[PDB]
């Protein structure tokens, strides 16, 4: 049972919609970690308390090199604090902003690390559902770490998340209230893969409705520089029908992955 007096807070690490994340030192052992701070009032106005509950419950029972550890939590009059493993190198979102695109070596390596973590998740029947770049964090060795388990759940599910926030990373089954499973994250791995090579996710549009349309009709094209190996993998992962999508096994053995990862 920890409290806020047990920590020294440093600078801010990020803003999510709900999370205000700060760097922290536990006073006792001098351990460096990150505190995700949530305001009771905004959770309660948005009615996302259940999401928090799932995040805490699911994320604490998971142990994997590529998954952000949740160490503990506690709360006070106005706030809830989650105690998290600190990720020194930022987010992939930021990496991507700095580089525009990633080469195949980097892309394929991130896809591997993702596939591993997902794999471990899925083996526990857990699905992330919110696998955007801003929730992919880098550890000290530049290894990728999955985070923000507020939208995670056990499979299968019907439950809506975002009323309409970013659809960019969501498969059709999801953007349409249908029962969906493990295959959801397979679709997102595809968006990510493509985004990583191109610098834009494949269904981006000026409006929500147009993106929605692009997504459900699976409308995307590749620019010229994208290699057949990549075209191939992205095409297998971005299938309308969830069950036509690869297994995590197949992705890792994919000739383009093995040719390019580390």
Q: Using the rule CB under 6 A, is 74 a contact of ligand T0X? A: yes
Q: Which of 130, 168, 185, 232 is catalytic?
A: 130
| Residue nearest ligand ATP, Cβ-based | 16
Pairing status of strand 70-75 against strand 20-26:
unpaired
Provide φ and ψ at 15, rounded to 5°: -120, 125
Q: Using the rule CB under 6 A, is 197 a contact of ligand T0X? A: no
Token readout for 199 is: 């610098």
Are the beta carbons of 23 and 32 closer than 8 angstroms?
yes
Give the residue numbers of the binding site for ATP.
Answer: 17, 36, 85-87, 134-135, 148
Tell me the closest approach of the beta carbon of residue 16 to Mg ion, in angstroms: 4
Tell me the closest approach of the beta carbon of residue 149 to Mg ion, in angstroms: 10
Which residues face 91 on adjacent strands? 137
Partner whose binding site includes residue 91, from ligand T0X, Mg ion, ligand ATP, none (CB under 5 to 8 Å by kind): ligand ATP
Cα dihedral across residues 52, 58, 60, 65: positive or negative: negative
Q: Using the rule CB under 6 A, is 4 a contact of ligand T0X? A: no
User: Which listed residue (15, 50, 75, 213) binds ligand T0X by CB under 6 A?
Assistant: 75
Q: Which residues contact 3 (CB under 8 A, 6 or more apart)?
A: 74, 76
- Rank residues 57 and 219 by Cβ distance to ligand T0X and give the closer one: 57
- The span of 133-141, 210-218, 224-232, 237-245 binding ligand ATP (CB under 6 A) equals 133-141
| 19 cis-preceded (ω within 30 degrees of 0) | no
């Amino acid at each position: 049972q920890w409290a806020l007096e047990d920590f020294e807070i440093g600078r801010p690490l990020g803003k999510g919609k709900f999370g205000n994340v700060y760097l922290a030192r536990e006073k006792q052992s001098k351990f460096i970690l990150a505190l995700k701070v949530l305001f009771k009032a905004q959770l309660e106005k948005a009615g996302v308390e259940h999401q928090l509950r799932r995040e805490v419950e699911i994320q604490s029972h998971l142990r994997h090199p590529n998954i952000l550890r949740l160490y503990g939590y506690f709360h006070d009059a106005t706030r809830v604090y989650l105690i998290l493993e600190y990720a020194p190198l930022g987010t992939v979102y930021r990496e991507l902003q700095k580089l525009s695109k990633f080469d195949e070596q980097r892309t394929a390596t991130y896809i591997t690390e993702l596939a591993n973590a997902l794999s471990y998740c899925h083996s526990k029947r857990v699905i992330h559902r919110d696998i955007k770049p801003e929730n992919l964090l880098l550890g000290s060795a530049g290894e990728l770490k999955i985070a923000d388990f507020g939208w995670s759940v056990h499979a299968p599910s019907s439950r809506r998340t975002t009323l309409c926030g970013t659809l960019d990373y969501l498969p059709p089954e999801m953007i349409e209230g249908r029962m969906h499973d493990e295959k959801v994250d397979l679709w997102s791995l595809g968006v990510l893969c493509y985004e990583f090579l191109v610098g834009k996710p494949p269904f981006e549009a000026n409006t929500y409705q147009e993106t929605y349309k692009r997504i459900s009709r699976v409308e995307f094209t590749f620019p010229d520089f994208v290699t057949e190996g990549a075209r191939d993998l992205i095409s297998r992962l971005l299938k309308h029908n969830p069950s036509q999508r690869p297994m995590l096994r197949e992705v890792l053995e994919h000739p383009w992955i093995t040719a390019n990862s580390s």
